Symmetry: C7
C-alpha cells in the first residue's frame, strides 16, 4: 500500500456516455478498489460529476486517459491521499 | 465475486399507482440485488417523486430501468453510482 | 430467511384515540415484526400526525395497513420502504 | 422474553418539587425499567417542563403514569413509543 | 448498577477556585467514575460551568455539598440518568 | 492507576515564536502525557491564539502551566477539564 | 517508539505547477510518514491554496517544509499540530 490512494476529481462531461459507463471503466483499472460518481449538476449539453477513486498506487495519467477518452475533461483535483494510511482531511 | 455496478441512486418520477412498495419488492427480487431503499421525495397531483437506492453486485442497469418502466416509472436522473469491489462513499 | 419488505416509514393521521402506545403494541405483536417506532409529529384539535417505523422480515403491507386502519388511523403516505436481504439506508 | 412497550419519551409538566432526581430514581426503581433519562426543557416560575425517556421491557404505561402523578407531575404528551423485540429508531 | 448514574449541572461559581479543582475534588468522591467540567461563560466576577458527573448510584446531597463547600452553587439539574443502563435523551 | 486530571482544553495566547510545533513537542514530553493537540485559533500582528488539548493520567497542571509560561505563552482560560478513572465527555 | 510530531495540518500556497499529486506523492515517500492528504481550498489566477494533512511518527518539520519549498510551495501557516504517543483530536 503506497503511492496515490484516493482522488476526488471535479469532472465536466457531455451527457454521453452515461456516468455508469464512466464508473464501470474506471472501476476496471487494476489498481482500483472502488469508484464513486456523484452527479453535481446537469446542464444543457454537459454534466458536472464528482468522481472519488480509491486504490493502491493509482496511475493518475491512466485515470485521466480513461476519462478523456470518453469525452470528459478534468476541471480540478479536489483531494489527493497518498501513502500507507488513508488520511482524512482535518477541517 | 464482487465487481461492476454496486449501488445506484435514482431520481424517478411515477404515478401514485402502483405504490412504491411494489417497486421495492420487484427491484429487490432481482438476482444480484442485495437490497433496495425507496425514499419519497415529494407527492404531487397524480405524480410522485422518489429516490431509489439499489445495492448489489454487478447490477444490470438495463434490467433495473426495465423493471421501473414496466411499472409506469421513469428515470429522471442517476444521482450516484458506485462501482468496483469496495463500496466507496463520496468525500 | 431475510427477504421481502424489511422496513416501512408510514405517515399516519389518526384521531386522538386509541393512544399511540396502543398502535405500537398492536403492530409489534404482528408476526415477523422485529420492532416498532411511533413518532409524534403534531397534535391537532382532535387529530394527530404520527410517523411509524416498522422493522422486520418479509413484512405483509396489507396486514400492517389492516392494523393501522382497524385502529382508526389512515396512511397518508409511505415515506420509506426497504426490501431485500440487507437493510439499505438512503444516501443523502 | 423481550416484548411490549420498550421505550417511551414523555412530555411532563411538574411543580419544582419534588426534584427531577426524585422522579428519575423512583421511575428507575420500577420492575422492568432498565433506565430513565430526565432532560430539563424549561424552568418556569412555579413549574418545570421535562422530557422523560424510559427504557425497559414490556413497560407498564399506567404504572409509569401513576408514579409520575403521585409525585405531582402530569404527562402532557407521549412523543415517542418503541415496542417489540428490537429497539427501532425513527428514520 | 442502580440509582443515579449521570448528572449534568448548571453551576455558578466565583473565579476561585479553578475548575481544575472542582473536577478534581468531585472526581475523588466514592462512586464517581469521571467528571467533565465545561466552561460555558466567564463574567466579571463569576463563571457558568457545565458539570457532567458519571458514576454508579450517585449521592446528590454529597455532590451538592462538595460544590457549595467550594463556593459554587447548583443553579439547576439539566439532565439526570438513573438505572442500570445509561439512557441518552431521545431528541 | 487511572486518576486525577485526564484531559485539559487550554485557551492560550503566545507570540509567534517559539512555534506551536515546539509547544506541542515539549508538552508531549511531560511525564504522564499521552498526547497533545494544538489548534491555531487566530493569528494576529504579534500574537496568535491557540487551543491546547492535553491527554494523559493524573496530569500536573502546575507543570503544564510552567512549560507554557517558560516559552512566553499565557493561559487565558481552561475551557474544559476531565478528571477521574474514566474520560467523560460533555452532554 | 511512537513519539514526537504525529500529525500536521499545513496551510500552503503554491503555483499551479507542479500538480498537487506530485506533492502528495513526494511527501508520502518521506520516511516516518504514514500518509498524506491534500485538500484543495481554492484555485486562483496564478496560484493555488491547499490544506495538507500529514500523518506519521516523529515527523521532521524542516524536512517536510523543504520538500514543499523545493517544489515551489510555501507554508503560510501551521493550523494544527499533534504530538506524543496517542493521536489527540481537538475538542
Ligand atoms: Mg446549472
Ligand atoms: Mg410540488
Ligand atoms: Mg396544527
Ligand atoms: Mg396539522
Ligand atoms: Mg400528512
Ligand atoms: Mg406524508
Ligand atoms: Mg409541552
Ligand atoms: Mg417559560
Ligand atoms: Mg413554558
Ligand atoms: Mg407535547
Ligand atoms: Mg456574560
Ligand atoms: Mg452570566
Ligand atoms: Mg445559570
Ligand atoms: Mg485575537
Ligand atoms: Mg484578529
Ligand atoms: Mg479567490
Ligand atoms: Mg492561507
Ligand atoms: Mg492559514
Amino acid at each position: 500500500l503506497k503511492g496515490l490512494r484516493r482522488l476526488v476529481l471535479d469532472v465536466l462531461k457531455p451527457h454521453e456516455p452515461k456516468t455508469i459507463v464512466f464508473a464501470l471503466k474506471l472501476s476496471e483499472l487494476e489498481n482500483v478498489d472502488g469508484v464513486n460518481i456523484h452527479l453535481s449538476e446537469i446542464d444543457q449539453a454537459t454534466e458536472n460529476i464528482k468522481i472519488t477513486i480509491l486504490g493502491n498506487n493509482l496511475d493518475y495519467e491512466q485515470i485521466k486517459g480513461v476519462i478523456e477518452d470518453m469525452g470528459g475533461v478534468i476541471h480540478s483535483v479536489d483531494e489527493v491521499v497518498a501513502g500507507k494510511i488513508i488520511v482524512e482531511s482535518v477541517e
